[PDB]
Amino acid sequence: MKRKGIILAGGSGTRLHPATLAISKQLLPVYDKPMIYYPLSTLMLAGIREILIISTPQDTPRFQQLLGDGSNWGLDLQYAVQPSPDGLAQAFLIGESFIGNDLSALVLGDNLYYGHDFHELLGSASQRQTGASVFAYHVLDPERYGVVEFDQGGKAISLEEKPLEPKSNYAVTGLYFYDQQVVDIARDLKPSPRGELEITDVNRAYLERGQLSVEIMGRGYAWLDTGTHDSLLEAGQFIATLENRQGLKVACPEEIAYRQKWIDAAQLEKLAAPLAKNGYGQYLKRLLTETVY
Amino acid sequence: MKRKGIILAGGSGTRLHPATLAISKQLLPVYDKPMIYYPLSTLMLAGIREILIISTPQDTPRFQQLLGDGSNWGLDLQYAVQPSPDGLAQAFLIGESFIGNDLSALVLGDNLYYGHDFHELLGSASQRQTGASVFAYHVLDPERYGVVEFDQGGKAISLEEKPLEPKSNYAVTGLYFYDQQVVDIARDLKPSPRGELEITDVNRAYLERGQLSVEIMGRGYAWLDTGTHDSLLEAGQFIATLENRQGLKVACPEEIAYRQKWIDAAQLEKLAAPLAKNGYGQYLKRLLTETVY
Amino acid sequence: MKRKGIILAGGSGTRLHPATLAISKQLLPVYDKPMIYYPLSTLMLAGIREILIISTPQDTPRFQQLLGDGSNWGLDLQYAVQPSPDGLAQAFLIGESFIGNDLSALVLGDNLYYGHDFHELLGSASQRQTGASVFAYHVLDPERYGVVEFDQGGKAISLEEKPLEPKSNYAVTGLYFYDQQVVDIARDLKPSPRGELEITDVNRAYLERGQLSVEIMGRGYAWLDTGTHDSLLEAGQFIATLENRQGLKVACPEEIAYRQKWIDAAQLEKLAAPLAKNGYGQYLKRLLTETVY
Amino acid sequence: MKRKGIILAGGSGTRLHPATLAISKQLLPVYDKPMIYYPLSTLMLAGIREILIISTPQDTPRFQQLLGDGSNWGLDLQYAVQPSPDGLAQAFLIGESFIGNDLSALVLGDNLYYGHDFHELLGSASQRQTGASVFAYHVLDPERYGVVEFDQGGKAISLEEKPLEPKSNYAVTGLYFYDQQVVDIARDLKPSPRGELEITDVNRAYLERGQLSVEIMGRGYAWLDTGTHDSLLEAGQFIATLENRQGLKVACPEEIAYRQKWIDAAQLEKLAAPLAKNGYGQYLKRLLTETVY
């Protein structure tokens, strides 16, 4: 059974205005590449090739201009709009027709992940054909996120959205895997006191049915914060330190497509040509003639 | 006599693609605010209130959405397009009608400046009603810029554009002041071997007429580099270290307009309202009730 | 069979003078803690509790003052000096008596490692009772290190020390695992043209006997550079970004001792007391009453 | 009349333990050079050549090894110890004999300053032969420092030490200038509730005699924070961004001595020799054959 992906790349309201007045946050580069390249690359590593990008009406065309129909990276990209920022769960109403009867995965357009064995850690969620799979990650400021409580045996027993008195320091990350129940669960959701359709209600419903796998994303992964000006900066520094150390890029979509065998060496060469006079183009070229373990 | 300003915020070509595929560089934020805020604030400190923003046809509307007509900050902003990126000196052909018979100033949309007595250092160029005035700044990599050579008495005697063997480490910054000759000098320029109308030829012409002042911008000023992904990241770290230290913002246009008395406390309050729930709105508010020396 | 550890924390000569005039590099903190805490914590994760710290004669006492005999963290630390910086392999002559007839592991005092499953990746070297095990990591500037060449089947076939024309981009990291042959191999080493006893000759000898495992340390690990002022800075930024994101520390020795069960909750509490008024002390306290996966 | 300088580089207690367990904070490098180089360079710019370095008994020899007697940079450096960290005003009891009957200046060993016209701003305090002169600098967190309150005419009217409800955002920096009364005012001070002899009481006494000048250090100066591990890291990023941009170093003592004519080109060359194979030596060399305005 094939899994469809959704990147929700919608409005951060005015919270980061004026930095984000002219353009939506997920088109801003983090270091050497546009933000959206990072969650897209995540979906690609989880093996997902059919992807719906959801964003504001102003910006959809900009995302289209940047990513096209995906055919150049061996993907099949489609697009849809979120008129008003009415909750992350709204993705599933908007995405209903695109999901159809398949399994799905939702990733937040501004969430960056890095680490070892990231294929395998996604795999284990990607290969469960039933229920929902989310990830929990220790953070300093759990109040800002969805907080998962574990019992003494490490079983997930409550989820709470931006709690004033968090039950743990474990935050739900912005990567979610779902079966064919998600749309129907989404459709029955009531708005919350904040006026939002919450992804935590979606995930609570799977918990109450005993069908939520909460997999731990360990301290040895980077899950980076793009929610303040400060953190956005920390992230660029973080990526640039890795890339300049290794001479290898994090979350380069072309490279993921090439290594998954979704495009061949001739196609990778054609993608490199129009950027040949810069580092990124030069990087794509070098991938054709280097073995990387 | 009054001086008109031009901010050239055009195409950086593909040099910073794909970071810049969705949006032009000068809309990317540096730390808490869009890039273009920094040179605009510079022109404001130099006392210039009538400014032409030149940009690509695709992005003009994004600059317009961000900056409007300037009326809100006591300015008068106008807009023009640069269909093709044919050299910085092109700004004077495109800007001819807007300049009319006045004095002018040109600033690169991606140049950030910071330091003490910046009013005074601009002033001394802004007050010279005849000839041209540029600024020379010691850098490590002068080969990337226009290099000014001085004789033993500190007189400027040659200018050279991206010389392979620079005569000094003094680079010409991207702030230029000009009298009513610039348009005519611009009109007579032939494209260079690179296919560009070079600002260094413009400035050489003033030097050959003995009408170029080259004022030193000292080491105690920051002139920051936004030309690589690395330097852009250095620049955000730099502004954010200053701002978090001081609780005062660098190159905030509203604050410059308020302190120059181009807008009053009532108007500053109205600008603060629609961002009240973020740091930038809160910062504008606090300016109404703090004396800053 | 038990494995003994050596941290070589010797002289970086004058290369980073004057930053390092007053103190050896491995006592400088990286972000919140002294450099040496990082490789020490690495040895601890590999399960090694008996450790020889080797350093200059000036600085040994400072290392002793900082780390004591280890008894407080469940280790057994001993100390020895390297009079002159005559090569990394010299560690084994100096360490001969301390090694005795056991297996060993050598870590460079200035090498930082971070990532997921780091226990397991060390384990696989730690559990091989015969031969030598090193790690290879893709880097941009292989000329600076020991470069390992692989054949088309991914077999290690040459090692070369700071080659002018590197055969790959794979660098040998500064973590090494060795059987009872290392001392005797070390003793037979000739100085090189540079006047050094090279760790690459030690490792070449194991390769020529077919007893070198070269395990790949993947792009999903951080191996950080502390060899320039710039990289040292990049590292602090890197650690601080992780720690402030997670509210968990990288390479805190006390925490590793506590989680390996080498000290109990009462002892961890006593270590926290004298630092109670700062973040580090507060962090140790919080480890007593939080479950971390 | 001539002015004597004191750099207090004592115990920061345990506040930054364990980072600082092996070595006192003021020997840690900020980017390319030891911390203490920055305030020492400040005293040098203020024209002061006779300087007492006060530090802990354990570290004095490390400061001596780094700085010698100063003869190499045209200074005269002397050393004293501070057995217990009993307040910044203690510097005048300890320093009594060294001060003798001269004017003085006190600078905190961990305070970094940068900006334009820094000579002039010091000058104006250095030239006032009577009373005391301090500097007030706008900060975000004035509650951590001595806060100066101004009346509507910009006259200083109260000073308060770490007030919970600060009267302004103007913090007193860690650079102080004093006449021959300071010793006697110091001697009459009683310890505060915290067990410290406060520099703010010293400065309040001069205010109550009408002899305190409070000069504004403007926003266009950097006064950097070295009090947390975070800020220390910000400070290195900050210096390194300036230095890599300009190819000129901030607070290099040899360069200040050379430009003040306290050492000649032959002596500067001899200081450059023993570091010739690193950037800092190369930088000193290049100063012999470049004009810097």
Ligand SMILES: CCCCn1c(N)c(N(C)C(=O)c2ccccc2)c(=O)[nH]c1=O
């Ligand atoms: C399946 C090939 C994946 C190889 N790879 C990576 N594992 C990574 N790594 C280490 C990653 O952690 C990573 C992060 C986000 C999305 C995909 C991979 C990467 O950045 N680029 C890659 O080409």
Ligand SMILES: CCCCn1c(N)c(N(C)C(=O)c2ccccc2)c(=O)[nH]c1=O
């Ligand atoms: C009317 C004087 C404005 C005072 N002022 C500044 N001088 C600055 N300074 C210190 C600046 O360096 C600055 C830089 C570029 C353009 C304008 C000001 C500032 O950032 N914000 C300000 O409000």
Ligand SMILES: CCCCn1c(N)c(N(C)C(=O)c2ccccc2)c(=O)[nH]c1=O
């Ligand atoms: C065996 C407990 C190890 C748990 N742990 C870590 N895995 C790490 N991590 C993620 C590491 O990557 C790490 C790095 C160097 C040395 C030891 C662990 C850490 O920093 N601190 C820890 O307490």
Ligand SMILES: CCCCn1c(N)c(N(C)C(=O)c2ccccc2)c(=O)[nH]c1=O
């Ligand atoms: C004799 C004048 C020295 C010129 N000079 C400086 N002004 C500085 N500047 C810009 C500085 O801000 C500075 C800061 C602290 C102490 C001394 C100089 C410098 O870093 N190095 C220098 O050689």
Ligand SMILES: [Cl-]
């Ligand atoms: Cl982990």
Ligand SMILES: [Cl-]
């Ligand atoms: Cl200056």
Ligand SMILES: [Cl-]
């Ligand atoms: Cl990996």
Ligand SMILES: [Cl-]
């Ligand atoms: Cl100023």
